[PDB]
Copies of this chain bind each other. A is one copy, B any other.
């Protein structure tokens, strides 16, 4: 109906007037980012809209954002919006709620410490070497390279080896059953017809769940469930995420099925995200030769030509950090951050009813001219140690913020940097005739290039 559709009107909150049943979902016809940009421009600091019957409050004031993401994380804003239909993946840390979430976050946090990270570096390193060799041969036969294919394959190689201990060159072994399964763990397009229908008829989710219909492919999760079981029967008895998880449940203990839910959600959270960002980075480097050259000069200085990167030397590369951060400013692939008000609240003068989704529009904030000079331009100096103090951590939020921020942030940052270093040590990347310049974005539910980035790759 429209019973909920008078909420923001009643609170004096501005926003696009909702249609019966649909709410404002027709405003998604150009994707999430364009919707949020336009609403921001038109309504200002705060606006309300409806995903079907679901009220969503967008906030843009960084003190408000602090209150939601940090200060009242545990009291009120603990969970993201409910998500289904799911089966056992209900126990995935990204989907879990309240005490169940707070428990998983505790069990898993030790796994993502820098100390653990540093021990994982040799493994990630090995597939940098693989990425290079794959790159090199796709180059010495001089045709333009599809980044998503080579970085996609890199993204997988690193997850498997660092999570399970499965050591596969996915690019050259694409019909390996493990590869064929895990490669299906792509990000959801919440603007596709199934999810729009679920948004308009959310009362159908329980019907789907009772039939065990789930948006995580059953065949894949079944396969991974069986794989995990056999590896646990290979480790017991005879350095990866699985081992650390195996060891932790070896004590309120990581259940068997819970363990596998986390393994799967890690792939899901890390696979296409990491691939996408690396593609964006290489696009920026290719279209800004001066930046690519300067980055190559830093790498060569820190690592006298082609010395292998280490954890310590990665942390030494300031310009590398700037390029990664500025690319993430332009392309915050989550686009929005979300928390549900689990009870009535009044934050910074504004009353928010229980059940409202409070949304932080990262993409819109990242490109807001009020906080960023020439926001559409790629300018790494934004993040130089001189200019860096100028950056509000509640305006710049590519990994979110607070207790429920990206738990794999450190790993993803390290992963990408190690990829970039090895790749840049060996090659230069340049536009091809069929490089899309300037880059156009998908008008779908995922922040990605409209067409895959294709670059000419030249050996140094």
- For residues 1 through 49 of chain A, which have their beta carbon under 8 Å from a beta carbon of chain B? 1, 19-22, 25-26
How far does the alpha carbon of A172 sit from the alpha carbon of B4 in the complex, in Å?
44
If A197-B1, A201-B201 touch, does A20 touch B20 (CB 8 Å cutoff)? no
How far does the alpha carbon of A25 sit from the alpha carbon of B20 in the complex, in Å?
10
- For residues 71 through 129 of chain A, which have their beta carbon under 8 Å from a beta carbon of chain B? none
A438 CB–B CB distance under 8 Å: no
Query: What is the copy number of this chain in the assembly?
Result: 2
Q: Which residues of B contact A26 (CB under 8 A)?
A: 19-20
Q: Which residues of B contact A197 (CB under 8 A)?
A: 1, 21
Mark A176-201 against chain B: 1 for CB-CB distance below 8 A, else 0: 00000000000000000100110011
Mark A190-223 against chain B: 1 for CB-CB distance below 8 A, else 0: 0001001100110000000000000000000000
Our pick among B1, B20, B196 for the contact of A22 (Cβ within 8 Å) is B20
Q: Which residues of B contact A21 (CB under 8 A)?
A: 21-22, 197, 200
Our pick among B19, B20, B25, B193 for the contact of A1 (Cβ within 8 Å) is B193
Output the least CB separation between A197 and chain B (Å). Answer: 7
Our pick among B22, B193, B201 for the contact of A19 (Cβ within 8 Å) is B22
**A200 to chain B: closest residue by CB:** B21
The chain A residues found within 8 Å of chain B, CB to CB, are 1, 19-22, 25-26, 193, 196-197, 200-201
Q: Known contacts A19-B19, A21-B197; can you find 11 more A-B pairs with CB under 8 A? A: A1-B193, A1-B197, A19-B22, A19-B26, A20-B26, A20-B196, A21-B21, A21-B22, A21-B200, A22-B22, A201-B201
Could you list 5 A-B pairs, sorted by A, with CB under 8 Å? A1-B193, A19-B26, A21-B21, A21-B197, A22-B22
